[PDB]
Design a protein around this nucleic acid. Structure first.
Lengths: 171, 61, 61, 51, 56
RNA sequence: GAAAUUGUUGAAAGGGAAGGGCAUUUGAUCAGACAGGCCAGCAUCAGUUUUGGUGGCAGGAUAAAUCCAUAGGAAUGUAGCUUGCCUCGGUAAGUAUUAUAGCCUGUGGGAAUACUGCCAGCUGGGACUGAGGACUGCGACGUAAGUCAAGGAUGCUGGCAUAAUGGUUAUAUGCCGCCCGUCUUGAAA
RNA sequence: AAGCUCGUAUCAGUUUUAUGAGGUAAAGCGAAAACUUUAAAUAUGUAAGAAGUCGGACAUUUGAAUGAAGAGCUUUUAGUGGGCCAUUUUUGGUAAGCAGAACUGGCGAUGCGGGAUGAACCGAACGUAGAGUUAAGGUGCCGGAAUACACGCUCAUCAGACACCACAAAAGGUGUUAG
RNA sequence: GCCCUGAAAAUGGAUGGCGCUCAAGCGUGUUACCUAUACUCUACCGUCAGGGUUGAUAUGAUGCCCUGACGAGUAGGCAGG
């Protein structure tokens, strides 16, 4: 829905002569807790031989962002299994927070690839501090000096069905 | 609980909460185009009619 | 009785079977969720949500 | 004959479970708990932010 | 098939016998798996390790 | 001396369907009852329920942030410096880490606010329902007497006291509606 | 439907535990995957107690959960004996369609909302009425409901509004966006 | 990923029609919302069930009162009118 980012660890159950295994951690994006948990178990069953019955959860913690309103360039390495074999992808965002960036990503993948939330994988978020190592261009053009641009053809959303005025946009 | 987890976070440790022992259950789907084993189940748990519900103790079985 | 429930106690099965299945309305607010019959994990309505039942039920009361 | 509800009809709320009255006085969900500065661990916040 | 039932019966009567001998509550009926309780874990043997699901 | 069916008068309708159902209008028509019937309205109460305001609390990283100080860093390089044009101040390229703007990061400080949850917290508006019929009892208020919003609604008032409401009926109108029964009935025709 | 023993009890299209008549080897370490070596899963059997336990001894926490205190013995009576579709498994196969079995669910006796209409779809426990809330489906108008908000992509010289993997189908294309 | 082609007939003809193109299309997310004999609350009917009931023969004992759940239905059966 509207998204959150969560921190999870699983501590796969103490068996005799191997108590306290190695506390496998993930950072997982979802709107709530239990969805987050289920995705941890889903990735974990993929990544090594676990089941939920053979595993147990340590904690859930919402990861707030350190300095939200810092505008950030993010770059995200992802995978998705579309109808073909699975395949990788990188994308780049100018945005405010990790969570909002992946929100926009999920919708854009939905547009351009008919890509579902269920069949997306995130590998990784990263943040780029220095400019000019961003690979893409459509963010890169939003980085120039003394920037100005217009809102052409602005339209006003009236409640009424009539207008008596012969409207205009401006310009 | 809240003091414990606070103190464990101070300690660099993690409180695992008790796995809960009670649930509430609600029937959603109504009566028909049901498979029979679940029908028998719900007759045990008295969740016959729609938007009917109850408490249940938690265990393996 | 409530304490017996929540601290699920000795005389719990007997209290529960004293109690009827609760007959609930449908939700006052809506469910949300245009479709019900997928898992809650998938944005559905069924399954195990484990705290949001309380929201759901005060709506359904 | 008739279900008179609790959760309005305070009188029948008091006909039952009469701990309500001292709930009225002390009010017992506006219960200000005693705050303790007890900081979390540095390792914990480090694994929170950093991986 | 039933050898489990017989050895269970003799275990049952054994705990019956000792519980009748030394006066204690009997609790002879079986008990299922049950919901597990709280237990602190501290990450001192290992710090929490984070994962990279590429998968390859 | 019925009905099919036919005429005549009177009422009404009608653009390639008839009749049927639900609700109503218009018209025609109609019975009852006022030593107290019909329609309604206001207030306070109860069950049910919808929709707003507002307060107090708890949690998380005891929010994160903003904000204060501090250290360091760097540019889509602010002041300042150098060169060119010159429209004589704006470019160009260098300089310059705060200066004649500021930013990023690290630590520390003390708050509030968010989102979530709780209130046996206050208050308002709206709608439907008002079964039940001496008393019994569970309860509250109060020292008590007595009282109440507590085992199903009573108080005040007005109009009409009749075709006004209501009913019946033709009819308009919105929506619905496959022609009956039988035999195979699995395009079930 | 009637009796008689009773609600003592009875069981249940159910889970849990233990167990085979068998391994799927998805584990090769168990001879250089050679190996029955058995992580299991594919489910029937069995049971979870006086109907039991070693002449004589031991009562309901007397032996798991969960639900139903309506079950059982004998006698007797009406109607009824075939069939389409789907799904799961699996044998035979065909260009393809498929054929055969086994289980299960729907329809049959059965209306209602939606699907524009409808044997097979989706939802749904039918006395009459009121009020409320919703399911599946939908909200430009017909048509009751937002010409709602918001990210993207699309501009077809007969698009699409499809139920979807599915048949033309592998590809062509100096259309277009992202990788 | 969309888009065109990726083959079609022959009465005139259909995304259901109108018509729709920063959508009234397509994938997606948020909310509010309409709506069935479904669910809930209430009244009423009826049946079944559990209880109470000779005190004034309280004049219907096949009565009277209290409480609760439930109602589809062909062949067919039982019962009351």
């Amino acid at each position: 829905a509207h998204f959150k980012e969560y921190q999870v660890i699983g501590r796969r159950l103490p068996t005799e002569s191997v108590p306290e295994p190695k506390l496998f951690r993930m950072r997982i994006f979802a709107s709530n807790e239990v969805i987050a948990k289920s995705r941890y178990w889903y990735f974990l069953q993929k990544l090594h031989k676990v089941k939920k019955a053979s595993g147990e959860i340590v904690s859930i913690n919402q990861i707030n962002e350190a300095h939200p309103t810092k505008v950030k360039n993010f770059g995200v390495w992802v995978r998705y299994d579309s109808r073909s074999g699975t395949h990788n992808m990188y994308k780049e965002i100018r945005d405010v927070s990790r969570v909002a960036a992946v929100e926009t990503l999920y919708q854009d993948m939905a547009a351009r690839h008919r890509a579902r939330f269920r069949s997306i994988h995130i590998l990784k978020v990263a943040e780029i501090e220095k400019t000019a190592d961003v690979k893409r261009q459509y963010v890169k053009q939003f980085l120039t000096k003394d920037l100005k641009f217009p809102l052409p053809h602005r339209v006003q959303k009236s409640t009424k069905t009539f207008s008596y005025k012969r409207p205009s946009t401006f310009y | 609980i809240i003091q414990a987890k606070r103190d464990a976070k101070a300690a660099g440790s993690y409180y695992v909460e008790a796995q809960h022992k009670l649930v509430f259950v609600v029937r959603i789907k109504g009566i028909n185009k049901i498979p029979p084993k679940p029908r028998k189940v719900l007759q045990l748990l008295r969740l016959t009619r729609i938007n009917s519900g109850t408490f249940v103790k938690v265990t393996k079985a | 009785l409530i304490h017996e429930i929540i601290t699920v106690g000795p005389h719990f099965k007997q209290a529960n079977n004293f109690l009827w299945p609760f007959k609930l309305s449908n939700p006052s607010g809506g469910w949300g969720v245009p479709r019900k019959f997928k898992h809650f994990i998938q944005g559905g309505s069924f399954g195990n949500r484990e705290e949001f039942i309380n929201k759901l039920v005060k709506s359904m009361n | 004959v008739l279900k008179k509800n609790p959760l309005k009809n305070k009188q029948v709320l008091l006909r039952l479970n009469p701990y309500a009255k001292v709930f009225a006085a002390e009010k017992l969900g506006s219960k200000k708990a005693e705050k303790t500065g007890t900081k979390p661990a540095a390792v914990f916040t480090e694994t929170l932010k950093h991986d | 098939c039933r050898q489990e039932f017989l050895e269970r019966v003799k275990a049952n009567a054994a705990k019956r016998a000792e519980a009748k001998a030394q006066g204690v509550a009997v609790q002879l009926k079986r008990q299922p798996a049950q919901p597990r309780e709280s237990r602190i874990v501290s990450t001192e043997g290992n710090v929490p390790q984070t994962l990279a699901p590429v998968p390859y």
